[model samples]
Every structure is written in C-alpha cells, then in structure tokens.
Target chain A: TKVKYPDGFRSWYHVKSMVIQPGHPLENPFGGIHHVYANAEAIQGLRGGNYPDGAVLVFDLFDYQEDNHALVEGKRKLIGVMERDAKRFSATGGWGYEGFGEGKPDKRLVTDGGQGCFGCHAAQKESQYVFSRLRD
Target chain B: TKVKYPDGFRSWYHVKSMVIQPGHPLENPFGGIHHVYANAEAIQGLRGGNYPDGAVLVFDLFDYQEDNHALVEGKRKLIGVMERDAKRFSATGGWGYEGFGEGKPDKRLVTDGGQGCFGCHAAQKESQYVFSRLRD
Candidate 1:
C-alpha cells in the first residue's frame, strides 16, 4: 500500500546494465550507470519480458566527473525503482514507478507515474518496460 | 617532433567505447569506461585501417563506483595514449605509448612511452595496435 524504497539494496545481486545518456530527458530522471538489481525471481522474469508480482528493479543514478583528464563517477543523483504488481499497479501495465532524490529517504520525487517511466520504455514494448538485455 | 596530448580531448570523436569487466582475466588495469577518444588524424587512420604519422588516440579510463544505492563513475583510474608515428620512436612498430597513473599532477603526464601499450595493441596486426573502430 505504501512506497517502500528498498534500502540496503546494493548487497543484492545485479547486472551492470547500461549508460543511457549525457543528460537525462525531461521524464526519465536518472542518468549515468544504471545497474538493474533484482531479486532472484525477477532476474528470471527479466529475460521473459513478463515480470511477476513483487519483482523490483532499481535504476540507480550518479553524476560524473570530467576533470583530471578523465570522466569518472561523482555524487549520488537519484534512485529510481520499477516494481511489479498485478492488482496494485495494474493501471500502469503492472509496473509501479517511483524515484528518490539524493536529498535522501524522505525526498521522493513524484513522476507522471507510469506515463513518465513507461513512455520511454514503450519503444521496446516487446521486451516490456525493461531497457537492459540480459547480457550474462 | 613532439607528441602533444590532445587538449580538450574529452569532447573529441569517440571510437566505439566499452566498459571493462568486473571478472576479467589477465592483467586488466581498467575497470570502467574504456573510451578511446581520437583526433582528426587518428579518425582518418582508423577508417583506412592504417595509422599514419601525427595520428593520436587517447584511452580515458575512469573507475566505477556503487555508492549506497547509486551506481556512479569513480575517479580517473588512468589515462593512456597510443600515438602513431612512422619514425622517431619506430622501435614499437611506429606507435609511441604513454600512460599516467592518477597520482601525476596535471602537467607532468606525457603520452610518449611504450613497451606495455604496444604489447597489447600488437594483437590486431591488421588494425595496428588500435582496438577501437569508427562505428558510424
């Protein structure tokens, strides 16, 4: 019923997914390296293009450094989540979207809900809202 | 004939970059974005599959970090350059290699030494010691 920002999630298993862009578009808030950390059940659901209930995938973003003759990662920018639910998040194609700013736990930046997250992911609708291919 | 490191090279043409693996074998000094930025001369040489004199390519290696829930870019792990030359430092197959550890101050790093760099690049004899290509 409430948004549960999965804390202590870095300890979970994940695949280093992708580098989206230089600056994010208007809707997609997160940028930089997006590592998709999912539970064991979700990992299998990822490749099938059909995620089940309770599956969670966090899109973690970090700003970067371009000084010192190198482009490196910097401060934490945002933490985005894509949770799967059948009845609860059914309005948004079974995916619940939420984002937390670097301002921390309480600072949950509201999105256009699914429209914001799903719209961009709609480009690859055949593979569901997941942008990353299972490389491993 | 002095080999000048391409200033503002961070914005130069990118040559089909990649990220180093976490479980990579061999002595891999890189564990981040292995981006190869090339100057105009180097771009042309990449197209022709034959690097000529005055062609320069820089390898910008930035480390990756996972801070809390944020997967971000890390520090400037290293910056190495592979400069093409017909003579002068012709001992390493017409390529002069120079590398910099993160410790060096801004001005001290030079892209003009070899041994290690040439050894890796020597694998792709057809494409010289260069690993990247013009994807577009």
Candidate 2:
C-alpha cells in the first residue's frame, strides 16, 4: 500500500497549529510547532466528522525559536500525512499513515503498517481517529 | 518602490483564516477564503504591535466550494504581501504592498506604490495597519 506524497499541500486549507515544547511529557518526536493542513476531501471530513475515501491530511512540523515573545519558525522537522482509503488500509482503520523527514518527498519514515500511528490515534476513535479539529 | 514575491511563504506561521462569501456587502474582490501567514520577522511585529524593517506578511487567498457543509479550497485567488521597510516605504506607513495573481510569482497585480492598499488598511492603524490577528 503506497500513499503518494501530497504535492503542493502547503497551499491547502490550514486546519490548525500547535507547539509542543520540552518537558511536556512527549517531546522527542513531537517537540516542535506543527501546522495542520487538509485537502478538499479532508475538509469534508473535518467539518462533517466522517472522512471519506481520498481524504488527505498533512501535519507540517517545523523547528521554532522564541525571539522576544515571538515564535519564529526555523527548519522543517517532518511532514506527517494521513490518507484515507478503506479497502487499501483496512488494517489500520482505513488510514494510511506516513512521514517524510525534513519534508522531503523521498525520505519515507513509516515502515510498519501504520501500527505506531494508529496506536495513538485510536484513542480518538469517537472522532474518526483524528486528533486535530477545524477552526474558524 | 518594489517588493519581491514572498517565495515559500506557504510554510510560514499561519496567523488566521477568513472566508468572505457572496452578497456580504464587500464581496467583489474579497469573495473567498484567505489565510494569513507571517514570517519570522513579521511574527515579532504581530506579537509586539510594531513592525520592524524586515517584516513580511502574506495573505494567501483561495476560491472555495461548499461540499456537504464543508468549505473546500479551490484554486488560489491571489498572494498578497506586505513587506516592511521604514525608510524605503515611508510614503505608505513603512510598508510595501503587492499582490500576485493566481499565486504566480510572475503575475504582479499591484501598481501605484501601495496607496490603494494603505487607504483601506489605514483604518486598522492601531494594529499596525493589519486586519487579521494571531489565533492560538
């Protein structure tokens, strides 16, 4: 099962943003300012709460530096993606999870069958296994 | 006198998002969903309420389609930019305004030295001539 890297996703609709700092429990892999973007199909799910097939969500993570109470974005840390396809990714609750290190399309990070990603997201099954919500 | 296109601004810090629908009084050119992004220098201005010389802000506008109670983003409408330089742009409140049509780097849409933009944004003088504010 291959979920192609979402091209031009930076221009998509921004869903939300979060900053995970040090000493907040989970910091190693998630310590950064991450912005969430959703494609057209994914927006339907975000608003309706039921992701349809072909929906794609992107988590654009970046390193940050605090300057005078301002958070300035630095280097990109990674690009996490979740593409929905019921039949293809049935083992992982109909979601294909992957990560590209440093936002490079060629750098694949997920080797397992989305087990690591699903294990955490599964806690939010009530909202279709999604963690982030849409904002105005 | 000239402001370069903000290349790679899509990955910047997202400040806020807004959607202007049809028949909303000011809908002709503003009928779309626009996401505001700020660069590192601009973030300092946003948080401190005073822009520095190197600050840059981007207004990424897009056409939208409502799909089942969801506003899905369509083609890019424009990429409006405001680059700050105190001495260079002293005529228009130390900000050089420009817009790139259809998100094309070569497609310039502003002329007349940013007077038109400053005329409208001047209303928000308290917020450093900015309409959008930081969300979360």
Candidate 3:
C-alpha cells in the first residue's frame, strides 16, 4: 500500500488505529486514571502504501470540560513505519522514498540500552499501548 | 460581570478557563486518569449576589510515550481548564466553597472532594496546582 502526500510523493502503510489517554498530576498522584479513546475512521487521512518511514497522523478530540460539564478527553499519536533498505531512506536529499527506504536497520527496531521500546509502550498499559484513538 | 450565553441567559460569572484530558483503559485500568478543571473570576449575577454556588471548573490532560525505542519510557499528563457555576452549592457539589458566601475563599482553605474541586487542582504538584498552559 502506498500514499501520496501534498508534495506529490508516495509512501506505504496507512494508520490502523489511534488511542489516547488523558490524565492529571494531582487526581492521579501515582499516575494512571482518567482517559478517553478515539478511533481511526474518524480521522482524515488517505489510505495508501509505498510510503516513507515518517508519516504524520493528525486528529482532534473534544475538550468537553470547557463547554459542558462532561469530561470528554482527546489526544493524538504518530507512528513511523520503515521499509527495508538504508539507501532508500535519508534525513535529507531526494524526494519520494528518500526518508522511507533503506537504513542500516530502522531505528524503530533496535531496542537496547534505553532503546528498549517495550518500556514506553508499557506506560500506556491501560490504553492497550496505543496512543491515538481510531476514529469511529 | 454579566455575560450572555448562546442560550440567551445572562451569566454573572464568565468562563475563565477550559481544559480536556484523554483517558485509556490499560495504563489507567482503574479509570483514575480522566479529569477536568475550571477556574473563574468572581462576577455579579442578576440577583443581588455573585454567581450561584456549585460553580464549575473544567480541566484535562494527556499521556504519551516519548522514547519508544529507548526502554519505552512514557508519561501521561492532563491539560485544559474551563469555569462555570451551578445554580446552588451543596455538600455534594463538585467544589469545596460551600457555606461561604459571595466573596472568594482563601487559598489555604481549599480542600478536595468538596465539589470535584481539589481533585483536579491538587493534581498539578509541579504547576502550583494550577494548569495555566491552556491560556498560553
């Protein structure tokens, strides 16, 4: 699957789902408390493949506490899925798959030292480790 | 301060702040992460006194993982604030300002569980218990 951006380039992979968790420092003194969920279909992005490693996902959640007494929370999450090949991916230069292709090994995979990815995901244990809610 | 709401009602206390917080099911499995707050300035109402008791305060926050590749260390925080007042105050109101009259109370006298008051403000240990970033 490939997606084209506003710049006229193509990339792979589309967002499957996004989850969010909102919290307060005091109410959740030890951490972990109030939160909400949004789904993917509710977001605005085209589905495609053959894309770069870095794709920006954007969405919105209503801040209910402001208008109504209801506590409707909201948030967003970004995921960078990389394809095999370092030469195909570059921080700069070229277009299209420049940042998506070829890397010594995608930084997303290496987990050592503080690079252990599980620790961070574990933090969102309540939201199933997903940071963005999938729109309905 | 007499402000008109879209509903055609004249409100003495205008909304001072608004906030939103997203929640999750896993990390905040206990449903403790979701929260809101609203702080407002004192205003005179159609009646001879200020806005009625049980005035409201809205607040919100979000949780995220920053270094997913590095041990997946992530944290969640609430953000946002909105203020409104209820028709009357009660022991079960969401704020602790019951019994007191039109004037504001001293900061030192504030308490949680009074009117859903302390739970949100008390959460901000580092921010002096006030989430002012929404105004920024």
Candidate 4:
C-alpha cells in the first residue's frame, strides 16, 4: 500500500547481521547484504525505549554470488529505506531517507536534502541515529 | 562448515521475500514470524540449481511488539539448529537427523524435526523438500 517505496520489501525484519563496511563512505559496490525491515513500531521501539516515530528502516541491498561452493545473495543491489517520521523528518534529526535502484521504474539513490543520509548516520550517537545497535 | 548449528550461516543470504505459511495446527502461541536462514545454494538451489548432497537451511521465530506504525513481527514461536555433514545436513532431509529445544543455548523447533526431520525431506524432491523454493 505504499507508493514511492515500501511496496513488499522481501519480507523485512532482517536487521543487518554483518557485512556492510564495503568501505563505507556511503559504500556501494554491492558487497553489502544488510537487512533491517522494520514496521512494528520501529522494531519494538528498538526493543528499549525512546526513539520511536513510525520507524521504517529497510536497507535491503544484495548481489554477492558464488553458488556451488557456497556464498549466495545475488541481484537487487538497491533499496535503502529509513524513515522515522519525527513529524515528517523534522530537519535531519528526525529521519526520512531513501535509496531505491533495482527496477520496474524506480531510481533514487540518495541526495535531495537527506544531508548525505544524516551525515553518516550522525555517528550513531548512542544508537538514536540508527546503525544496528538494536538495544544499547 | 555445518559443524554445529549456526556457524556463519552462510552469511544468512539476507534475501527474504515472503510467502511463508505453516506452524498453525491450533497456533503455537508465537507463530508470527519464523524464517530460519538460507544459503547452501539458497537452500538447495532456489535461484538456480546444484545443491542436494546434504544442504541445510532454517531460521527465524518471532517475538516483537509495539502494536505497529513501525517495527512488526510478534507472536512467539521457536526452533533451533545445528549438526551437519552427512556430508552436511541436510536440515531434516536425512534420516537420523538431530534436533532438540530449550529457551536458548542453541535453538530447535521445526517441530524438532519430529525425527529424521523429514527423512530425506521426502527424498527432498530436489527443491520441493523446500528450503524456501529459491528457484524451481
């Protein structure tokens, strides 16, 4: 029921277990298979408290193949999502990002007023800016 | 390296689209989200092929809350894992499989395999044995 984003979203709730420093500059060569499909009150309010607005973080990227011997995750290579809705992203401190890039008439990437995606997630100051801290 | 249960988990693949369904019977209390992991050829070759000689796959159970507006998945179901190398399990597709349950310390619940997991997953049928049907 979304329009510019949040259509199906693989399934969601994956939550970046590992592999995302591809180099991190904003990294994007594709070795980043992180996932964090939130949608239930920002993952249960980050399982702690404070910092819950409508949470909708979904990094979803992919493309890391290898098959036979092992190592999967091909295709996709796009879709970042990350919205908190603090009154509709009240000046970068609230949240409302995007990434899209894998097909059927959709292509955004990042850069409109996102402030470089909150300037590297604002260094995850105490996890509020979000960086897979999950719970303290 | 299916040495124990969750060793590396093949990077978890992190694709997760959707279409899961099962674990009902009368409801297990927390049957909201249960995905388990994937790899070993997207669970025995889902996006393509080649992966039978004892592949392994399984992941996720649920426990999330907050109503919604963001962050989802709740209910409270379960399952655990480990034990590979029949050449490599074959998560319940091999007779004499192994499974057990307890709050933590490992995880187990695909009905604890119910013994032999599925006895070669019904001879697996090569993909119907189901790893999420990554392919066809």
Candidate 5:
C-alpha cells in the first residue's frame, strides 16, 4: 500500500460532513455524503499552527439511498486518506494520499502517484496543504 | 429545565447521519439532515445491552440547501435530546426527552412532558428503548 490504511478512524474525532450531488464540479469522482475524520495528531494541526508528522485524515464517502423521504447511507464508495511523512512524500508537501475503494485494503484507487491528489490539495498551501478544518 | 441542554455534544462521538425530506412520516418535524451523537457515557449503552443513568444522546438536525451540486447545511433546526435517569425519568423508561429549537435552550420544543416522545420509543423496548445502534 502506498499509504498505510487508517485503522480505528471510526473512533477518531469527526470533523464534519457534506453531500455532493450530481452536476457538481466534484460530482464525477467525489459525489456522495462524505464525512471527515482526524486522528489525534491531526487534531493538533486542525486546532492551531502547522501540522506535524504522523497526522492522518480520512474522508469516508458513502453512496446514498433516498428511501421513504430519508437519505439513508448505502454502500460505501471510498475512504480517502492522507498521511503526513515529511521526508518520504516531500514532493507533495510531506503528505501521502490514497483511496481505498469500499473500505477494502485490497482495492486501491489512487494510481497517479498522488499527483492528482496533491494538485487539488496544493491550493491549501497556507494550511500545510490540508483542506479540512476542525468543527470544534 | 426538565432535561439539561447538552452543553457540548458537537465534539462527542458521531454515530451516524441521515436526511429526512418531505413526505416522510417524520419529515414534518424532522425534515433536514440529522446527525446522531453520543456522549462518552452514551457510547457504552449504544455498543452493549443497556444504557445506564446519565447517558446522553443527541439528534442534531439542520436545514439543508441544494447548492450547485451539493447539499450544504443551512441553519440548525433542532437538537433533540435524550438523557437517562432511572428514577427521575421512570415514567418514560428511565429517559428524559426534550427538543431545543435552533439549538437554543431558551427555545424549548417539548411541552407534553415527554409522553408523546416516549410513545414512539416504546416500540424499541428490547434495546432499552433506544432506536440507534453503533456503527462500529
């Protein structure tokens, strides 16, 4: 695996969630309801100052089912992950990116060596290339 | 106040979330995206057999806007709360129920002494009168 799978993120600090509908710019690859989560080390960076190595962030995306006027969660689409490793991924601002399709380790989704992921995240250079903020 | 307003449930463990649109049985009052949260004590009950006294569960509901291709969160609608207290809330199977409109304690929404609320919860008598389950 390019980046180690984030285990136990379900128990980590939940940052926030949003739904991406059809026709959105990010609908093709990033549609659905995505929930952001941060590990302990990532919490420190999301609070104040810059991120230290070992910070991990996860974007858990799920397919939605509109049933009986309720948008219930269907099958999982993917779990995007970002891990901090200063020297290892220095080209991408010391961060490693990967996507696990259906939350399975065997199903790797990222194949561009993180260039595509870093390209979008690069806009957040001021925030150490991180796009999420802590909810509290 | 019959049930103490949950001071800081936003940072609690997020159990899950769903959207209630128009036409659903619960839509008239619960229309919007509602996220379920559980306090530390409440987590114990959600994972196991029964909830002990002092366990607090929160249903944070918010109005949603379809922007571009996304469903963004609008203003908060309400925060429905349930706190367990065996003796204090013995009538409702040891649980206190209340709704804080717009997330303000001053705007109390429950006026029926929780009888109406308990009526629906009574169906889940097997799970200690709880309707939620832990995801992980």
Candidate 6:
C-alpha cells in the first residue's frame, strides 16, 4: 500500500523481493521483494480506499549502484520484475537518506500507514523497505 | 464504584483504630493497633460520594506481607480488629476471607449459607481507589 507524495515527486522505485523461510515466525511466509513502480495518481487512488493520502515508498537499496552478484546468490534468489506500465519517481530521486530510523514522517505507523507496516518495515537499514536476506 | 449485592449481606464494615508507622509511605500514618469504632456509613457517604450498596472498608498495613515480621504483625493486628467487630456484629454478622491472590467471584461466592463476600472485594487488589490514597 502506497500513498501519493506532494508535487514535483513521481511515484516509482525498484523494491527488492523477500522469501519466507520455512519454520519462520510469520504465518504466510512465501513472498519475495518485487520491483514496483508507484505514481502519485495511482497511489492517490490506493489512498482513497480508506487509506490516507500521504504515503511513501521505501526501498531496501540506495540506488542499485553496487553489483547484485554477492547480494543475491542463495536459495532465496532475486527475480527481476517491474510494475507493469509503471513510471519512475522518487523523493529527491531516491538521493536523500530514505533509510530506516532517519525520522521522515512524525506520526504513529498504524494510524497513518496500514496496520503493522511500520513495525515490520522498520527492520530495514539503508533502504526504506528492502529485504537484504533474499538478495544474499 | 461499588455495585449492589442482591443477597442479604451487610455492605459495610466498621474500621477499628489502625496501627501505622510514623513515617509510612501513606499519608495520615499514625496510631497503635487498638479497638476504636469509626462511623462506617457516614465515612462511606462522605468519601464514596454516595451510599455504597456494596462496598469494602480497607485497612492499610504497615509493611509488605512477604517480610516475615511484617506478615505476622500485620495479620495479628487485622485479625484482632476483625475478631472484635465480629463479636460486636454477631446478631447480624457476616464474614469471608480477605487476602491477596484470591480469585474472582464464581458460582460459589453467590447465594449460599457460606460467606463468600471476599470474592467480590478481591477485584480491587490493583486499585488504590478501593482505599483512598490522596496524592499531595
């Protein structure tokens, strides 16, 4: 679930996939990170469905600058896929520190974002919502 | 916040003189354990803001019961006062267990020749509201 950013910011980013390891704590564990492109208009539509109007897309990587050889070589493999007919967008072209714990929006996660989004997504370090375990 | 007990049970109990240390954590801490009748109904009306249809009068103990000396001394003081009141109210007497870790009111605490009022009063273990603790 994504929300629309303000003017001068398009909605699109390469989100890494995640794999659910067996005997994991989570209930439904089989899901990998996928490259999803989000736009302000599309996100606004998503927001209209009971969600708020201001949501940010967090990524697990900085700019895909590093080679993915070491990062994605395991039983949990990275599969390349983009959001169909998606456009490129980012807050400062994903240049600024969108990493976890840098203090972006000042509010409780569940009330503003969807339930458990903040708690689960917060474990990421450099990327906003990237899962490095699947890549490695 | 006391609720009504439909069974023929005396809702109030008189508090004899309470023994408390001079510099106890509670306010108005002074007195030696001795028999002194307090106006139970009048005090209930004044402090409870209404005639409690069912209420308990609590006595503050000086020390934690886990401490050996405090346990023996505190129990002796409370039981001594209760025994005196029990004799005084023998014509219309009521009695039940009053202690920590007692569970809630089950079907047993309800209508029966047996005294089961303690189950109802035991609900206030966590609430200082049961016994007034005025913050200075």
Q: Pick the candidate with the highest TM-score.
A: 5
lDDT of 4 by residue, B9-96 (tens): 5235443432122343323332333445665544445556654444555544554342312223444344344333443344444322
The regions of model 6 sitting more than 4 angstroms off are A1-15, A27-112, A125-136, B1-136
For candidate 6 chain B, the 10 contiguous residues with the lowest summed lDDT are B1-10
> Which is better, 1 or 3, measured by lDDT?
1
What TM-score would every model get versus the actual structure?
A: 0.49, 0.56, 0.22, 0.48, 0.91, 0.17
Candidate 1, A1-55: lDDT as tens digits:
4457877555344444445554335324555644456765567776674687888
Please write out the lDDT profile of model 3 over residues B13-131, one tens digit for every residue: 22222222233322332121223223233222211244344333332222323232111112323222222333222332222331111111221222443445445445753543334
Model 2 interface CAPRI class: incorrect
> Candidate 4 docking: what grade?
incorrect
**Ten-residue stretch with the least lDDT total in model 5 chain B:** B127-136
Ranking by TM-score: 5, 2, 1, 4, 3, 6
On a 0 to 1 TM-score scale, where does candidate 1 land against the true structure?
0.49
Top DockQ prediction, candidate number = 5
Lowest lDDT block of 10, candidate 4 chain B: B17-26
Question: Which window of 10 residues has the lowest lDDT sum in candidate 2 chain B?
Answer: B64-73
Expressed as tens digits, the lDDT of each residue in A16-131 for candidate 6 is: 22222224343132222122223343344333332122333333211111122111212212211111111222322221222221113322122322324434544653443323
RMSD of 2: 12.3
lDDT tens per residue, model 6, B1-136: 1112212111122222233333533223222222122234435533445423223343322222322222112221221111112332332242222322111222122233223433443455344123332110
Residue A3 local lDDT, model 1: 50
Query: lDDT of model 1 at residue B113?
Result: 60
How close is candidate 2 at the interface, in terms of C-alpha RMSD after superposing the true interface residues? 13.6
Q: Candidate 2: where are CA atoms >4 Å away?
A: B1-35, B38-136
Candidate 3 chain B: 10-residue stretch with minimal lDDT: B2-11
Q: 2 or 6, which is superior by TM-score?
A: 2
Per-residue lDDT of candidate 2, residues A1-136 (tens digit): 8877999786577776555666655567977667789988898898975788999999888777755433456778899999999899999899999999998989999989789999999999888888887753
Q: For candidate 6, report its TM-score.
A: 0.17
Chain A TM-score across all models, in listed order: 0.81, 0.96, 0.24, 0.34, 0.94, 0.26
RMSD in Å for all candidates: 16.1, 12.3, 16.3, 12.5, 2.0, 23.7
Candidate 5 lDDT over A29-108, as tens digits, reads 88888889998888889999567788999999998987987888778889999999898888788999999999888899
The DockQ scores of all candidates, in the order shown, are 0.03, 0.05, 0.03, 0.03, 0.68, 0.00
Q: Write the per-residue lDDT of candidate 3 for residues A1-136, one digit (tens) a residue.
A: 2222212111111122112224433221112112221122212212223223343332111222322322233321112221222133222111112121121123222323212333544475454333544310
